Design a protein around this ligand. Structure first.
Ligand SMILES: *[C@@H]1O[C@H](CO)[C@@H](O[C@@H]2O[C@H](CO)[C@@H](O[C@@H]3O[C@H](CO)[C@@H](O)[C@H](O[C@H]4O[C@H](CO)[C@@H](O)[C@H](O)[C@@H]4O)[C@@H]3O)[C@H](O)[C@H]2NC(C)=O)[C@H](O)[C@H]1NC(C)=O
Ligand SMILES: [Pt+2]
Ligand SMILES: [Pt+2]
Length: 266
């Protein structure tokens, strides 16, 4: 109670242990704790197990903590949100066997260059995945199979050149897809499926406007009302689209939805 700043507000309390040169979990944290901020600390190494005691813990922040190795010992059946952004994890952690109730996981701006074959197994309650800012160049086959309830996915600002044709297969709740600032050249036929994607960010990519981009073109047209441009400091980006932001080779004067496709089949 008297080490970090403990908030209160109706039952579920919030403990802030940020910017406090901590190298590990502080000993006198209230037991019936629910949210823990531990950002801007020196957690070069951290063991999810040391939280076994806080049976009411639902949100944990370990962002901007020079984190390099996350240990996944036992279980925290009630943890739903986990923030790992702005650390140095060279490999993505396997949380399935520990955070069965995790609905949000952010592992942005870390040092990821790929993702394992079972990466998200067990994470069936996931509703949000943030992996923006790494150096992913390719995604695994059924990555999102374990997460059929996914709503938001961020793979922005990586080095992706191609996306799996079925990456979205099954996700009928998906509403936000951020793939901006990558190295994508095309979208596999029927990639978006028939689902309705409200917020799709596809700008900043070197799209190759050849016949094999006519699928994406029609989609762009059908969903021009759903294509937006990212604004850092995000303003909920809830208003005014810009389908002309998706462009051939990133040339502003040659948006994809206006791509002619001269001499292409129907
Ligand atoms: C992922 O995509 C981003 C966005 O496109 C990309 O950023 C830019 O890439 C170029 C490289 O094509 C950057 O220039 C780099 O500068 C250093 C050179 O020392 C290196 O990062 C790159 O090449 C080096 O690679 C090794 C060192 O890492 C060595 O073999 C040797 O030093 C090579 O030169 C490249 O030259 C350019 O500055 C960035 N822009 C910025 C400021 O971000 C990023 O490079 C891509 N990363 C991957 C996964 O390749
Ligand atoms: Pt960030
Ligand atoms: Pt759908």
């Amino acid at each position: 109670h008297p080490i970090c700043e403990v908030s209160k507000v109706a039952s579920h309390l919030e403990v802030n242990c940020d910017k406090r040169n901590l190298t590990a979990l502080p000993p006198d944290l209230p037991k019936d704790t629910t949210i823990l901020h531990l950002s801007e600390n020196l957690l070069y190494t951290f063991s999810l197990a040391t939280l076994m005691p806080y049976t009411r813990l639902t949100q944990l922040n370990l962002d901007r903590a020079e984190l390099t190795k996350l240990q996944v010992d036992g279980t925290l059946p009630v943890l739903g949100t986990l923030d790992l952004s702005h650390n140095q994890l060279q490999s993505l952690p396997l949380l399935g066997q520990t955070l069965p109730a995790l609905t949000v996981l952010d592992v942005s701006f870390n040092r990821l260059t790929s993702l394992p074959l079972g990466a998200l197994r067990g994470l069936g309650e996931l509703q949000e995945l943030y992996l923006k800012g790494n150096e992913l160049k390719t995604l695994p086959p059924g990555l999102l199979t374990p997460t059929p309830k996914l709503e938001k996915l961020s793979l922005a600002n990586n080095n992706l050149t191609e996306l799996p044709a079925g990456l979205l297969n099954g996700l009928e709740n998906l509403d936000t897809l951020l793939l901006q600032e990558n190295s994508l050249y095309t979208i596999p036929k029927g990639f978006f499926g028939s689902h309705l994607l409200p917020f799709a960010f596809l700008h900043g990519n070197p799209w190759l406007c050849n016949c094999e981009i006519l699928y994406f073109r029609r989609w762009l047209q059908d969903n021009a009302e759903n294509v937006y441009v990212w604004k850092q400091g995000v303003d909920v980006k809830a208003m005014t689209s810009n389908v002309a932001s998706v462009q051939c080779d990133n040339s502003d004067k040659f948006p994809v939805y206006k791509y002619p496709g001269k001499g292409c089949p129907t």
